[PDB]
Amino acid sequence: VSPPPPIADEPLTVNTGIYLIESYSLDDKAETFKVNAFLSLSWKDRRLAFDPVRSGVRVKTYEPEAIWIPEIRFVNVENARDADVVDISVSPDGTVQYLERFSARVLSPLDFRRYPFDSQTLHIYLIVRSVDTRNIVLAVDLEKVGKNDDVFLTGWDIESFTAVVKPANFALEDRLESKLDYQLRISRQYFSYIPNWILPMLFILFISWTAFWSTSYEANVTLVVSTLIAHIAFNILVCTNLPKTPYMTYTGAIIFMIYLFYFVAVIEVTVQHYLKVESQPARAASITRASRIAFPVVFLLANIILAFLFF
Amino acid sequence: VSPPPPIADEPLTVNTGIYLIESYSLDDKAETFKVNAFLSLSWKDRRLAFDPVRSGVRVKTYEPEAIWIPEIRFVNVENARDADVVDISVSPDGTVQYLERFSARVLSPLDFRRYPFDSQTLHIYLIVRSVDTRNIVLAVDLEKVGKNDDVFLTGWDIESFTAVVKPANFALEDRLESKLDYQLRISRQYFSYIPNWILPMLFILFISWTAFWSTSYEANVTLVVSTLIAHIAFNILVCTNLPKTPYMTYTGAIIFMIYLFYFVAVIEVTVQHYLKVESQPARAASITRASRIAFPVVFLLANIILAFLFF
Amino acid sequence: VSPPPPIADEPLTVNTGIYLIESYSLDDKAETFKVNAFLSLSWKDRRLAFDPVRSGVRVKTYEPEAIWIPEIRFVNVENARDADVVDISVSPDGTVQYLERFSARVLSPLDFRRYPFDSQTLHIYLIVRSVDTRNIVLAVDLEKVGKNDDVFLTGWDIESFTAVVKPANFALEDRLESKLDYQLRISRQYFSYIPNWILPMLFILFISWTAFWSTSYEANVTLVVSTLIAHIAFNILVCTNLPKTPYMTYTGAIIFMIYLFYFVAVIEVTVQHYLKVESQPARAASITRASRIAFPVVFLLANIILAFLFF
Amino acid sequence: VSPPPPIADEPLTVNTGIYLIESYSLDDKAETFKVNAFLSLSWKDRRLAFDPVRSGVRVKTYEPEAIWIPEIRFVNVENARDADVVDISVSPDGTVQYLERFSARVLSPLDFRRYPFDSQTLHIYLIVRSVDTRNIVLAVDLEKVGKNDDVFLTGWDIESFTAVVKPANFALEDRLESKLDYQLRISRQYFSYIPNWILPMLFILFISWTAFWSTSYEANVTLVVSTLIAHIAFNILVCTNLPKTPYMTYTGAIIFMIYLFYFVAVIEVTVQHYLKVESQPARAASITRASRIAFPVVFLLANIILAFLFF
Amino acid sequence: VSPPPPIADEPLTVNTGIYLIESYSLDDKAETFKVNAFLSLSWKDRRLAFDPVRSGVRVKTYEPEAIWIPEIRFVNVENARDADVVDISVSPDGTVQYLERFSARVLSPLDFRRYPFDSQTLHIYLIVRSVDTRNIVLAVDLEKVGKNDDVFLTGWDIESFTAVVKPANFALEDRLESKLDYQLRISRQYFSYIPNWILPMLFILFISWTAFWSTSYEANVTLVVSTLIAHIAFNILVCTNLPKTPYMTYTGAIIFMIYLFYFVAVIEVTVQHYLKVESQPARAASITRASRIAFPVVFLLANIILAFLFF
Ligand SMILES: [Cl-]
Ligand SMILES: [Cl-]
Ligand SMILES: [Cl-]
Ligand SMILES: [Cl-]
Ligand SMILES: [Cl-]
Ligand code: NA
Ligand code: NA
Ligand code: NA
Ligand code: NA
Ligand code: NA
Ligand code: NA
Ligand code: NA
């Protein structure tokens, strides 16, 4: 079966549409997500047109084998070709209404610099390669683009599922390719992070600042170093599985700054002790007293700067 | 093969029934479970009807290819079509009785706020898309809905497997959809959590409260901080298998409260030491003495409040 | 293809046999195991009868497609239908002799209360659903039930592979099911646990008892608390691979009892210190001296009781 | 269908080309990567040649079944044959132009001695085995070799995707084999490692060097040993998953040298204490004072030597 | 298609040969490895014999369907039947030369007592079941057994890939089974373990021995216990990937011994302190002085004994 011939040197327009049934498994590290949806395709093949009176039927149903179907493919899928045809209907004029159910593991990059207060725009790209007898272009039938009300993506808030209606028509290996961009907009549910990660992490850091109200070097070393181990362990406890970025993330800056704070705390503790030993308790006292305000103020300030830089 | 034509403008009623053979693999983080089951389908197609006296047979058996079968689909499955036809029987009147064995990874959301004392209602949804020639509705044959007595789901207690007999009726892309809700009611076996997690975690926290019977700052710092590290490692030991919720869980609250208790214990230990150093041992003694009753009483009280709020 | 007709109202006996080629992947958590085996089936289909004088051949060989084969299914598998037909031989009488190679992830529950000194009985259940024209019953050909001498299951000792010869013939969804039970008896190789887990865990607990020979509160706090951390880390090191049971396990009890011992050790250390501080070193000495015999004796006794309760 | 016969004892030249659509999942431990790409093949089959005036068509399209296609295989793939034919076009002279979409998990070794500042050359090898009737050789059509501009490999910078134009002809099991080498050149995005791993690891080591400004053995033991634990935990936190190499890696040497520094630090702390106890504080002071310059200088120097040796 | 008939009561000899293309994924815990190879089969079928002159061809090519092919199977594969036929060629006398590309996940047990200085013999077993008309036996064509020069297995050294030429012919379920043993000899690349595991682990133990140069019980308790935690974490850091053996391994013994050393060190530290407290510093000094030589000597000696017992 060859493609439908043109009426007069025109390309075949294939009207597309993705309707989301289920969304699941957003893998941050892999930068992938899985989807269960309908794919609707509509085009005109005049060769299939008929008189409804003669046939005694208002619409004819076909098997995929029986008629010519455009080779529509997904660009960014990790999944194998997972598709089941639901219906093929030919209206009296020769308009074919194709419908299939599919599931795919889609590969779309994520921006982690605002993590865990980040939002994403996931993409599902559709392509079709132009054939020797006719060029093919994609179109969006907005009536056949949407998502079911049940559609959820664990740990995320689903904002929208739209399509950039104008395709990207370009040349590849001497043939025309027509590409559409379906966008799934989502925003991370950040609630969990504040009682489960930010607050316990801030408590461990604050414990280290009690060393500014002690003159016991043995107690201070234990304080600052034990909270440092506790901090590490706490992030081991998180089992952070955020991929490696060629850029700095909001979380990454904060964590780094916290290591620096743990370091400076050690220096203060060391200086205070050295001065007490060097029979200069006057300076040792001044530094310790200053650090009681310096450490919380600098931390709060640095965080304001960081928050500002990231958002 | 087209659907059976109506006697007089009536929809095709497809009688369904899911009989659970095996249930397994409840993934909390994925919010999925796997199932091994029978799917029974029955509808009337008068074109298949026969006079048994002529046939010399009371029931005729068919191959799926040979006759029209309604395209029943599962809404919420992650799984690829995994179905094997067991039997297709046509009664003399035209009633087709279809039976298949299937297995599926079902995606059903879970409520974690009462975790690990939570109960779930898992769903298996069946759909049928109405066709161009005839509209289709799903029905439940209660005699063909059940579970085998062996059916177990590790770490859970299986309460029931029932079906909401009335289907959903709605339009999708200009066609009528008939959905059925099969509900598998389960309740978490919480026993394990009390000796393996709750009690050892309460012991580590109690050890920290011995600092209210000591005046040794070095010993107290060691106590409170080491038990805090211990706590973290103990939860790292858990290797928590719980998804990130946009809400607070019972477990989540408890853990948070325990971090707060570790923090306040440090403050007391710090204050008691500072006052002893400031030559005010009368206040330092009063605080330490109060804390001996305050810490356990507030903890017990706060837990009563939480338990009340969650259950 | 319909089943063979009865001579006079008798059911079709399908003689079965599983011969294990390979066993592997016993997943404790999942309660599953994988198997590579032969499945032998035999029944009579007189429609296939032939005269070898005419046929020239003493036994005919067929393709699964060519003849009626009973729909034998595995009840408790996770796996998809993974089967390769090796031979289908028919003798002049019509007796079919079917052989296939299969692999399957079998789901059979495990009893963990005697872990890691536990023994298991794994099951492989065959079923055949009776058809409209003839009832089908399963049978065991003992000559075709066994395991190869190489057959191993890592971390377990394979005792036996036998079959309950009497099938569980019952009624389901108005038809007759004939169920056979195959039993793979195994016992856990517990050697590894004693030098790798039991002994280093007993050493860490013993180190904590050295606090009964010290009067230094700072040293005692360090001892008892650091060994508690060590213990946690050591079970984190084990990365325990056991499921959550609705019952108490031998290992589970031991671990719990060890946590309780760590707690009571802290109480003693606390009491001894408070008394010394309260200028009552006479009682503090008595307690510490008693604890030197109390803790080992109570531990040994409690373990005898537990061992007795579990075995 | 047999291969096209030679005009006069010449081998069949199959013009190849791989066009990368998507690259993903570079697994360092497995030394594998996944690819989604076009495979273009072209050969002249003179039996397929046609007169365009008689046919009334300038190019004929075929089904893979209809014509002889060379058996091109990938050498180094872990993946199963995942290929979908897009187009088969025969020009009037009989020159077939084949195009397929494939995805494969490619096994190519990696050099870890410069990790995490390493660059790789990934290989995709195409083979063809000469047949009994005609010998086959591979060629590169440079116009059909490339990658889309979107092509990304998470955590890596994609430099180039080129092919060694000259194939490697050799004999195997008495037949001629034509191999082509496609090279995907990538360099690791090392940014992440400096704030997330190198710097916090250097801070933990610096904290241990404060023991050179203290005379308190109890405080020093705490410092040096706790930071040693922190270092371990920090690398557990990294969950380094870099395979086991028969050679020393840059990272591996650094880590090793850090363990040695932690050991020497303990010796210094031990020596300093022993001398103070032996009433030789003059030597103890000299050593501690020396160590303040010795440790940082030796470390900086050793790192320059290492960097030089590795780069 | 029946098997070729015998000339005079002789079995059919099928000449086999495995040629390794790729080897990868040696899973120690699963005791499996993956392979990509060629399988060459050759047998004589006189029904396929021809006069070269009549057909005008020296060799005829076939489709697997067209001719009788022996059902050769792999015994110890976890993998599903992953095979692609490359070529089938019939020589004028009727000798069929079959060639296929396969990939399999092979299950072969491993000996871990000399780990990580262990060597393995991995097996690939080929079986053939004798048919009703003719008995089939396996043979090795040594010219068709080998491995490509590129063949590597990460973390191992590939010594040889040979085949025990005499098959194991035996009776199974009343038919004759002919089995061939293909052997892949490998030896572990142990370099990595000495700087990454053995040496940092020995350093942590040596740090604990500094307690024999200190009289400070608080410092010694910290030393011995902290290094014991460090040791655990260091093996948790290693996250050892070795299954559970019913026998003791070299690594296993070493680790155990190290735990015993950590325990004895605590005893010494406890004894030394008790004696100092009991105002017997003469004995306390003697023990500490002895331990300075006892611990290294006993350790070195015990290791010599162990090494000797294992190798
Ligand atoms: Cl696609
Ligand atoms: Cl479905
Ligand atoms: Cl089955
Ligand atoms: Cl391939
Ligand atoms: Cl096989
Ligand atoms: Na399509
Ligand atoms: Na169906
Ligand atoms: Na301490
Ligand atoms: Na069957
Ligand atoms: Na510690
Ligand atoms: Na090909
Ligand atoms: Na075969």
Tab-separated table of C-alpha atoms in Angstrom, chain D residues 29-31 71 73-81 105 107-109 127 129 132-133 172-175 177 179 217-218 221-222 225-226 228-229 232-233 235-236 240 243-248 252 256 259-260 262-263 266 270 273-274 277, chain E residues 19 21-25 36 38 40 59 61 82 84-87 89 99 101 103 115 143-144 150 152 154-155 189 191-193 195-196 199-200 203-204 206-207 210 213-216 218-219 222-223 226-227 229-230 233-234 236-237 292:
chain	number	residue	atom	x	y	z
D	29	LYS	CA	30.283	0.365	36.245
D	30	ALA	CA	28.808	-1.643	33.270
D	31	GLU	CA	30.871	0.451	30.772
D	71	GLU	CA	22.751	-9.123	7.324
D	73	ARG	CA	24.957	-6.778	12.818
D	74	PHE	CA	26.419	-4.773	15.749
D	75	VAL	CA	29.361	-6.457	17.412
D	76	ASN	CA	29.402	-4.876	20.881
D	77	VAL	CA	25.669	-4.757	21.859
D	78	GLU	CA	24.229	-6.166	25.139
D	79	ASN	CA	20.697	-5.349	23.774
D	80	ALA	CA	18.398	-7.782	21.750
D	81	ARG	CA	17.692	-7.020	18.008
D	105	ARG	CA	22.786	-0.848	24.812
D	107	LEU	CA	29.297	-2.204	25.466
D	108	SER	CA	32.496	-0.075	25.037
D	109	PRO	CA	35.354	-0.011	27.655
D	127	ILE	CA	29.880	-6.273	10.949
D	129	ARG	CA	29.733	-11.824	7.115
D	132	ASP	CA	29.025	-18.458	-0.067
D	133	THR	CA	27.979	-16.795	-3.400
D	172	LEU	CA	36.405	-15.780	10.899
D	173	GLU	CA	35.355	-19.484	10.947
D	174	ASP	CA	36.499	-19.725	7.204
D	175	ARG	CA	34.467	-16.681	5.974
D	177	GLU	CA	34.156	-10.347	7.795
D	179	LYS	CA	33.921	-4.402	10.478
D	217	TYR	CA	45.539	14.222	73.803
D	218	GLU	CA	41.810	13.517	74.471
D	221	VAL	CA	42.356	11.750	69.446
D	222	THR	CA	38.743	12.994	69.015
D	225	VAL	CA	39.742	9.849	64.595
D	226	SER	CA	36.336	11.589	64.227
D	228	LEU	CA	38.737	9.878	59.778
D	229	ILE	CA	35.191	8.462	60.446
D	232	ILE	CA	34.752	7.299	55.389
D	233	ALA	CA	31.046	8.331	55.858
D	235	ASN	CA	32.617	8.518	50.728
D	236	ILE	CA	29.899	6.169	51.768
D	240	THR	CA	31.178	5.701	44.763
D	243	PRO	CA	34.149	-0.189	38.678
D	244	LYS	CA	37.207	-2.084	39.919
D	245	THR	CA	40.211	-1.250	37.781
D	246	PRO	CA	43.449	-3.309	37.479
D	247	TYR	CA	45.146	0.164	37.532
D	248	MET	CA	45.350	3.165	39.857
D	252	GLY	CA	41.966	6.414	43.909
D	256	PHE	CA	44.743	6.550	49.337
D	259	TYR	CA	44.204	7.649	54.362
D	260	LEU	CA	47.982	7.775	54.760
D	262	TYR	CA	45.153	10.400	58.568
D	263	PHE	CA	47.517	7.628	59.755
D	266	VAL	CA	47.651	9.792	64.509
D	270	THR	CA	50.649	9.698	69.674
D	273	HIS	CA	51.613	12.785	73.850
D	274	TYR	CA	54.217	10.115	74.680
D	277	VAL	CA	54.232	12.098	79.385
E	19	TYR	CA	33.036	-18.551	19.414
E	21	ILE	CA	32.207	-12.216	20.501
E	22	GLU	CA	31.562	-10.373	23.866
E	23	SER	CA	31.659	-11.350	27.533
E	24	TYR	CA	30.285	-9.005	30.166
E	25	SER	CA	28.354	-8.593	33.468
E	36	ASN	CA	27.504	-12.747	23.047
E	38	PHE	CA	28.473	-17.681	17.559
E	40	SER	CA	28.188	-23.450	14.851
E	59	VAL	CA	26.723	-25.075	-2.087
E	61	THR	CA	21.623	-22.007	1.241
E	82	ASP	CA	17.856	-15.211	22.336
E	84	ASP	CA	19.407	-15.319	15.365
E	85	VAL	CA	20.357	-17.607	12.433
E	86	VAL	CA	23.192	-16.142	10.336
E	87	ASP	CA	23.644	-18.924	7.723
E	89	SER	CA	24.835	-24.081	4.020
E	99	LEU	CA	25.657	-20.681	12.196
E	101	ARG	CA	24.505	-15.462	16.897
E	103	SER	CA	23.511	-13.941	23.813
E	115	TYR	CA	38.405	-14.179	47.320
E	143	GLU	CA	38.396	-25.035	14.585
E	144	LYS	CA	34.998	-23.505	15.539
E	150	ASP	CA	39.019	-7.935	22.106
E	152	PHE	CA	37.282	-8.704	28.084
E	154	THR	CA	35.621	-6.195	33.629
E	155	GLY	CA	37.522	-6.892	36.861
E	189	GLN	CA	42.160	-8.693	39.071
E	191	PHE	CA	45.228	-5.075	42.463
E	192	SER	CA	42.323	-2.655	43.415
E	193	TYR	CA	41.685	-4.407	46.779
E	195	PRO	CA	45.037	0.179	48.114
E	196	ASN	CA	41.247	0.510	48.247
E	199	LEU	CA	45.583	-1.001	53.390
E	200	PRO	CA	42.975	1.580	54.707
E	203	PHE	CA	45.603	1.615	59.028
E	204	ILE	CA	42.361	1.817	61.113
E	206	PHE	CA	47.023	0.196	63.625
E	207	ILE	CA	45.464	3.450	64.932
E	210	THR	CA	48.349	3.393	69.679
E	213	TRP	CA	51.376	3.932	74.298
E	214	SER	CA	48.725	5.744	76.359
E	215	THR	CA	47.634	5.471	80.012
E	216	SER	CA	44.551	7.715	79.479
E	218	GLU	CA	39.169	8.008	78.258
E	219	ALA	CA	41.558	8.462	75.290
E	222	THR	CA	37.847	6.602	72.293
E	223	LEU	CA	40.739	5.153	70.212
E	226	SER	CA	36.056	4.826	67.307
E	227	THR	CA	38.385	2.714	65.099
E	229	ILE	CA	33.081	2.017	64.316
E	230	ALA	CA	35.401	3.264	61.495
E	233	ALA	CA	31.643	1.936	58.251
E	234	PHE	CA	34.657	1.196	56.058
E	236	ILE	CA	29.657	-0.650	54.934
E	237	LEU	CA	31.578	1.844	52.708
E	292	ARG	CA	53.088	-3.319	72.082
